[PDB]
Structure formats: C-alpha cells, structure tokens
Design a protein around this ligand. Structure first.
Ligand code: HEC
Ligand code: HEC
Lengths: 161, 159
C-alpha cells in the first residue's frame, strides 16, 4: 500500500503542504499579466504536482484514487527574452493552490474535491473554497474528473490503455 | 546512486523515468514569437535526478554524475478558462546534460551535452562544444545551468 500524502486538521482542512516540489510534476502553463490586462486571475506561471501515491495509482488505472492531492504552484514571469529566444521565463515564487479528492472527508462537494487556497507559504493550513469560487470552473471545462488533464501531458501519457 | 546509464564510450542511454525525477522549472519560446520557428519549440520542462537534487539541497553545487533532462512540448493552445497565455500540448522530444569530471575532463565544466533523434532512439548523440556548451558557458547563471530560470533550485540551495 501507499503513504498518505497531505496532513489534515480535525475539521479536515489540509495543512500547508511541505515537500510538494518532490512529488510528481504533471505540467506547466503560463498566463502573463500583460496578456490579461495587467491582472491575470492567477499570476503567472503555474507548476502542477500530484502526490506520489496517487501517481502510482494513476499509472495503473487512469483514475484519481481517494487521497489524491494536487498542488498548483504559482510564479511570476521573470523575463520575456533569453538566449533560447522570445517567450516567457519564470522569476520568483508567488503562492500555491491545492485540491484533495476524498469521498470520506468531502462527501458533499462536487467530485469529492476540496479546493484549498493559502494566504501565504508561512501559513499553517489553507482555506476550503465554496463550489462557486473553484469547482464550478473545474467541472465545466476540465477534461477528466474535474482536473484539466488537457494541459497535463505527463498524466495523459502516463495512464494505461 | 547514479541515474544515468551509459555505453562504453561514455554515451548516455536514453533516460527512462526522468519524469519521475525532480522538476526544477519550466519556460516557453513559442514559434509565433520566434518567426514561426523557435530554436527549441516550444515549452521546456526541466528535471534533475533525485540523487543530484539531494546533494544540491546540501552544497548548492552540481556533483559529478549530475543528470539534467530538458523535455520539450508543443504549445497546445493560447487561451483557456484561466485566461490568455500559453498552455502545453504534445511531447516533442528531449535534451540532456551530464556532469562528470573524470569522463568529460576537457568539456567546459565537465558537462557533456546530448541531443536525441526521437523518443524511440536508444542512445543520444554527444555534441561538439560549439553546438551547445558555447551558449551555456556564455550565459548560464551557475556552472553552465540556467538557474536564473529554475526557482526550485534557487529556493532549494542553502543560502
Ligand atoms: C488549475 C488548477 C489546479 C491544478 C489542477 C488542475 O486540475 O488543473 C488546481 C489545484 C487549482 N486550479 Fe483552478 N484551474 C483552472 C484552469 C483553466 C487550470 C489549468 C490551466 C492553467 O494552468 O491556467 C487550473 C480554472 C479555474 C477557474 C476558471 C476561471 C477558477 C474560478 C478556478 N480554477 C479556481 C480555483 C481555486 C479557487 C481559488 C482553486 C483553489 C483552484 N482553482 C485550484
Ligand atoms: C535549457 C537547456 C537545458 C536545461 C538546463 C539549463 O541549463 O537550463 C538543457 C539540458 C539543454 N538546454 Fe540549451 N538552453 C538554453 C537556455 C537559455 C536554456 C534555459 C531556458 C529555456 O528553457 O529556454 C536551456 C540555451 C541554449 C543555446 C543558446 C543559443 C544553445 C546553443 C543551446 N542551448 C544548446 C543546447 C544543446 C545542443 C544540441 C543541448 C543538448 C541543450 N542546449 C540542452
């Protein structure tokens, strides 16, 4: 069996994940401010991680086990040009978002996903989000099980046939 | 333990499982911002082997036997529910660099660079210094690696 990644409070709120940068990377996207009227909803680079246990489970099944934790880490754009050419390059770390799939802890959320915001990296836990703030966009547009796997080529290529 | 596999000529065998290594940052040079032909199209996802990553959290240096994999991927779309920008598509190929003072003692920084003809290739191709190391030497922030673009490495090192 596999470890339980993610620690929770007695009210089932995920404590601020540490060590996620050593989980399994599944994809990176970028919404720069300048392309979104100098205020993107989520600045700017986004680096996404799934915990190792649920990555083993995904390789075997193409499905997110209960106990999946997915962390989106946000970063500024640092430059627009490099010796490799024109585009977008990351600067400093900005913040994180996370989501947890758990039928037991979250029996009445869409998909059993609890979406967590964090007010800082120094914060002890996150704040669980209403269905209008987070999960509604994810159920409408995400390709599989409310996860935007159409932007996670590690996922698509890592599921079996 | 070491994470490369080699032939007798110190040629690196096409790495398997590098997506299970430690991701250290991502950038994007789209073709539309580069005269419809980027040098390295388009998204770049960079990884360092876990053993070298452990030594980096200790020393902030690249130990001998360090392997870094840059995986390339197309721009799949330029808009999504999160807004305008660039979003990944399909996997294009890989590049790799390897640090070894004893096997590459004449390469700049003991770093051999490897190109790969496709995902199905068995071994890379090792590159002359002008093809790759020339530009890494001139411009990379640390020991030929563009750590100005790897915040996981910068946040990770012991300052
Ligand atoms: C990425 C995200 C992730 C990573 C996992 C995933 O399924 O992609 C998490 C844990 C998370 N968000 Fe998010 N979200 C949206 C899109 C399009 C992407 C991937 C593309 C990209 O990287 O830009 C996401 C969409 C939306 C959205 C539509 C406007 C809203 C309102 C939200 N998301 C809201 C939230 C959260 C509330 C603050 C929250 C904690 C999220 N998402 C977590
Ligand atoms: C990224 C790269 C990496 C990842 C580690 C790093 O040092 O960033 C590898 C293993 C690799 N490339 Fe190089 N490359 C260049 C730049 C600016 C970056 C980081 C930011 C980004 O993703 O865009 C790189 C630049 C250049 C360059 C300047 C004109 C040249 C000539 C090369 N790269 C050449 C090569 C290779 C020759 C075939 C090769 C195997 C590389 N790079 C590998």
């Amino acid at each position: 069996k596999g470890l339980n990644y993610g620690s929770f409070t007695k009210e089932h709120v995920l404590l601020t994940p540490k060590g996620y940068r050593e989980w399994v990377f599944i994809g990176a996207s970028v919404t720069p401010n300048e392309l979104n009227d100098d205020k993107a909803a989520f600045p700017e680079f986004h680096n996404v991680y799934i915990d190792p246990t649920s990555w083993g489970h995904w390789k075997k099944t193409g499905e997110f086990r209960d106990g999946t934790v997915i962390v989106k880490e946000l970063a500024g754009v640092g430059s627009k040009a490099s010796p490799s050419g024109n585009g977008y390059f990351p600067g400093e770390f900005n913040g994180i978002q996370a989501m947890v799939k758990d039928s037991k802890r979250y029996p009445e959320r869409p998909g059993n996903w609890a979406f967590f915001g964090f007010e800082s990296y120094e914060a002890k836990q996150g704040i669980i989000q209403t269905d209008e703030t987070c999960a509604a966009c994810h159920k409408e547009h995400a390709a599989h099980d409310m996860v935007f796997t159409q932007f996670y080529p590690v996922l698509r290529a890592g599921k079996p046939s």
